[PDB]
Write a protein that binds this DNA or RNA. Structure first.
Lengths: 146, 67, 108, 297, 119, 83
RNA sequence: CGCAAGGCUGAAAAAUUGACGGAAGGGCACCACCAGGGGUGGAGCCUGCGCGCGCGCUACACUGACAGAGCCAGCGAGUACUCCCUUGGCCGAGAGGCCCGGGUAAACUCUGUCGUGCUGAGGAAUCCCUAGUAAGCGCAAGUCAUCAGCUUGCGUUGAUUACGUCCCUGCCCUUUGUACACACCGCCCGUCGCUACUACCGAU
């Protein structure tokens, strides 16, 4: 999912679920940011159907991606060829032979293919002291700005 | 919870803080204010009482009777 | 150990990028960039907490002698619209007497 | 007055730090006293410290007094423990609802010496200011969600700790009819605490049992007809308020008279309600790995 | 110290002596008699004097300027003006030392803070 | 009245808490129920076991007040989830 | 490793100090009286608690609508914040980026223009409230629990009526102690227990 509105800790997360029934099932679940910020699904959101409120560890950014790592069970298929070679047998092909025979390209996601990431050097803003605090603190520690 | 309350009430042990006397230090016996060798150790105790009278007078007079 | 691992044990794991449908929002913040963001915020909040302690435990009758050669931070009422809590400093300029300005204007 | 509150809080914090260093030394001095009485040989690093022996000869007696329990620890409650009746005011949030105001009245009636105050337009530093100006022992703030309360904030004064807790399963006094309920008796309540074993549990036990006025210790084991129960499981302290008659020497009839909570504390701060920047003593560690496995209190 | 360690009058006078010295501000703790061994000190008395305690309270900048100001008589302790620079300020009168009534130093502080009320 | 006072009055009416009777008073009692009333006492004086409204009915109709047990209902629902 | 670790068995007292009251006299209380104010309860929406119930929110006209003029706050600053989803077209071998369409207050004060017109302020009950309190109003934040169907702050405007009494409803306590002078009061009452002694009754 994707953050929608971001407060200090509670962020509203949009493109993850489709309904408040699904959110009520996944209430209390351990949600996570890509960056490493943990968090918890708190409450379904009413007016946009499918959004929810999740209280995170610290403030997440709008560029972040919010994942929930569930474990879906996979059952193997119950196929069984005997390799009766002296009689004759049908050999099931591989996926590459199937794709080359019936002419379908391999599925490739451009968002999945690795790229080089151009990171600019992170420079932060200076400290912004409030006016009332900056006028109330004493003389030896008063801020001097021309 | 109800059975815990009943057990404490019956074999009554309560964790309330109890009202202590405000002068438990100076008056430990709690006398009523109306109508009413070891000699080496006693001499040492009386010497400490005399020393503390002198020193408490000096310290209160040096703090100028704010004490 | 370090000799009991192959080169495929040593091979680096690449980092995924922001999706191309979402690249306008900026870079995808991972653990390193998040650590930088959290360090800067914890540092700024530490300075602000120390400033709030110093403004709380302030003697209202303190008297330094720089108070006779500095202009105070004032209030919004006394200063006006141009009120920041910072004590204004001097830029180095000074009100200049008439004989020296006569000399400077003869030179100009 | 305000300079005295700030000065006394700073003196308390300095005395606590000095007590930390002195405890680090006095753990070594208690081995020297136990080895002197029992004759078991002690460590050379302890027995060859001349400063420790030279100061041990003066500081025997407070260790003996702490062993006998004759002295009490430096605390914010030990100054006025059973001497003064702790006065405590209960307040709401800013614009309360009718069920929050009736709940505020109900937990006012839980304490026999409490008073309730209307918030209205009352800035929270001036609330703290008026509490220190009228020498209140405790304030308790209430927060509602929608006619149902969700948080308490129990703050001890002049500089004592806050315990902020979230409320669950609140069953109000104001839901049952007046034919079945009645006017609650205001006698000095007995208190029982069940399941507090850590030093943090004894901390929350202290800051909860110093809200109630001290009971007269002459015949308190049999007299008095009203009990208040704080019992915790899974560090969510659940509280009941009963009134009882002793119908025999072997049996007792209880009657639930007050509201039921299961409050869970999430913040214990060594500093009052105004100080948002006070140093916390404990806080509910969610979003850690084993913060749900570990049980405090 | 020379009394036996389980003695009642020893324990009572230990608590009395430590409480008296901590109320006068000489000791910084009231839980050790080794404080009165090697922490009670003429320097501790001399730093409980008045110009040093108002140097610490930042009423002045330095102890020299503080002695000059309380010789000129700007400082009261409580309600009475103090002209003696040796007045030992205890721990609960450090909350009451402040400037005098018509003080030019007080007018200087208010003129710096731009709160000079001439009424 | 208070819950304490009404509890004491109902137990004095049921004779569970009253003065220590003599053998002659016990003879009078053996000369001349209470569990069925003690069940009603232990249900009425512990009113938080069940959910009640305070206002009573909104519109009085006359035709010929416990509205739910949350404790018993929660335990029953948890047994259903266990099964 | 040793002890714990062998079932006259089969679920649901203490008291010379104790058990329960009554009468008189005090103290206190917006869970009491008295004087007023305000909710909820009527219509709609919905969290929550168990179709019902309240808690909030909204609509419901003289306190009016329209147009002007003037004039007021406080808390709030993490290279951080964005309400959707789409018809088209640009540059795009392809993924995208563009362009154009569709869905620091409220209040207050002053001056004019029109005039009650589905354009109707909540019953019985029940609860709360005594000074910067009730009530109106907006602005901001979203702090490891709770909270966006809202929460918590912050400023602004700011009353009526009590501020007495235990008469009603209750709650607590005196009738033992806890200090001494003046001064005042003057053996509160019942039903039983327990103990000590005295004699009685009748079986063994």
């Amino acid at each position: 999912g994707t953050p929608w509105k971001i407060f200090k800790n509670t962020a509203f997360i949009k493109d993850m679920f489709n309904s408040s029934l699904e959110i009520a099932k996944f209430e209390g679940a351990a949600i996570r940011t890509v960056s490493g910020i943990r968090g918890q699904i708190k409450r379904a959101l009413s007016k946009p159907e499918g959004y929810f409120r999740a209280t995170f560890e610290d403030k997440i950014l709008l560029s972040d991606i919010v994942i929930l790592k569930a474990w879906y069970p996979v059952k193997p298929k119950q196929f069984y060829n005997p390799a009766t070679n002296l009689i004759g047998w049908q050999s099931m092909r591989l996926t590459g032979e199937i794709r080359r025979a019936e002419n379908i390209p391999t599925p490739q996601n451009p968002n999945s293919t690795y790229r080089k990431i151009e990171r600019p050097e992170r420079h932060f803003n200076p400290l912004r002291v409030p006016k009332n605090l900056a006028a109330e603190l004493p003389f030896k520690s008063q801020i001097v700005q021309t | 919870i109800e059975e815990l309350i009943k057990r404490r009430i019956l074999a009554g042990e309560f964790d309330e803080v109890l009202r202590r006397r405000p002068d438990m230090f100076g008056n430990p016996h709690g006398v009523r204010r109306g109508l009413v060798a070891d000699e080496k150790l006693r001499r040492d105790e009386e010497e400490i009482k005399r020393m503390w009278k002198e020193i408490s007078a000096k310290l209160d007079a040096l703090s100028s009777w704010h004490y | 150990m370090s000799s009991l691992r192959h080169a495929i044990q040593r091979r680096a794991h690449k980092e995924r990028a922001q999706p191309l449908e979402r690249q306008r929002l900026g870079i995808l913040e991972k653990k390193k960039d998040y650590r930088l963001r959290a360090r800067d915020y914890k540092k700024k909040q530490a300075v602000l907490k120390s400033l709030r302690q110093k403004a709380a435990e302030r003697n209202e009758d303190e008297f330094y002698f720089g108070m006779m050669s500095r202009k105070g931070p004032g209030s919004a009422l006394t200063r006006g619209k141009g009120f920041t809590g910072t004590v204004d400093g001097d830029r180095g300029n000074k009100a200049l007497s008439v004989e020296t300005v006569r000399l400077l204007k003869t030179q100009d | 007055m305000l300079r005295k509150q700030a000065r006394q809080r700073r003196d308390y914090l300095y005395r606590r730090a000095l007590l930390l260093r002195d405890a680090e030394i006095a753990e070594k001095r208690a081995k020297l006293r136990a080895a002197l009485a029992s004759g078991k040989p002690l460590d050379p690093k302890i027995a060859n410290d001349k400063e420790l022996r030279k100061d041990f000869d003066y500081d025997v007696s407070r260790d003996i007094a702490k062993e006998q329990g004759e002295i009490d620890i430096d605390d914010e409650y030990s100054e006025l423990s059973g001497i003064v009746d702790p006065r405590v005011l209960v307040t709401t949030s800013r614009d309360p609802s009718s069920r929050l105001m009736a709940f505020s009245k109900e937990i006012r009636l839980m304490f026999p010496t409490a008073i309730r105050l209307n918030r209205g337009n009352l800035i929270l530093p001036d609330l703290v200011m008026s509490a220190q100006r009228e020498r209140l022992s405790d304030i308790i703030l209430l927060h509602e969600h929608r006619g149902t309360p969700t948080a308490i904030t129990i703050s001890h004064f002049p500089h004592g700790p806050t315990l902020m807790a979230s409320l669950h399963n609140v069953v109000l006094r104001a839901d049952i009819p007046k034919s079945i309920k009645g006017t609650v008796s205001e006698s000095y309540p007995h208190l029982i605490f069940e399941g507090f074993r850590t030093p943090l549990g004894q901390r929350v036990v202290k800051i909860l049992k110093h809200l109630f006025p001290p009971r007269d210790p002459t015949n308190n084991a049999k007299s008095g007809n009203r009990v208040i129960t704080f019992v915790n499981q899974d560090d969510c302290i659940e509280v009941r308020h009963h009134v009882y008659v002793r119908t025999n020497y072997n049996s007792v009839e209880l009657s639930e008279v007050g509201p039921r909570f299961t409050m869970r504390p999430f913040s214990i701060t060594m500093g009052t309600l105004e100080n948002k920047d006070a140093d916390v003593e404990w806080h509910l560690s969610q979003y850690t790995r084993t913060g749900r496995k570990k049980n405090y209190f | 110290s020379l009394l036996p360690p389980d003695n009642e009058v020893r324990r009572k006078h230990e608590t009395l002596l430590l409480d008296k010295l901590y109320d006068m501000g000489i000791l910084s703790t009231k839980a050790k008699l080794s404080a009165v061994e090697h922490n009670v000190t003429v320097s501790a008395f001399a730093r409980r004097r008045l110009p040093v305690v108002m140097t610490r309270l930042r009423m002045a900048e330095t102890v020299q300027a503080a002695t000059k100001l309380i010789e000129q008589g700007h400082v009261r302790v409580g309600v009475e003006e103090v002209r003696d620079p040796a007045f030992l300020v205890t721990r609960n009168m450090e909350d009451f030392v402040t400037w005098t009534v018509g003080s030019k130093i007080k007018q200087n502080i208010m003129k710096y803070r731009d709160k000079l009320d001439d009424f | 009245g208070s819950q304490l006072k009404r509890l004491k009055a109902s137990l004095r009416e049921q004779g569970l808490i009253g003065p220590q009777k003599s053998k002659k008073q016990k003879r009078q009692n053996a000369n001349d129920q209470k569990a069925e009333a003690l069940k009603s006492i232990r249900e009425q004086f512990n009113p938080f076991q069940f959910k009640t409204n305070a206002r009573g009915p909104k519109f009085e109709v006359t035709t010929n007040v416990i509205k739910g047990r949350p404790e018993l209902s929660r335990a029953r629902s948890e047994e259903k989830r266990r099964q």
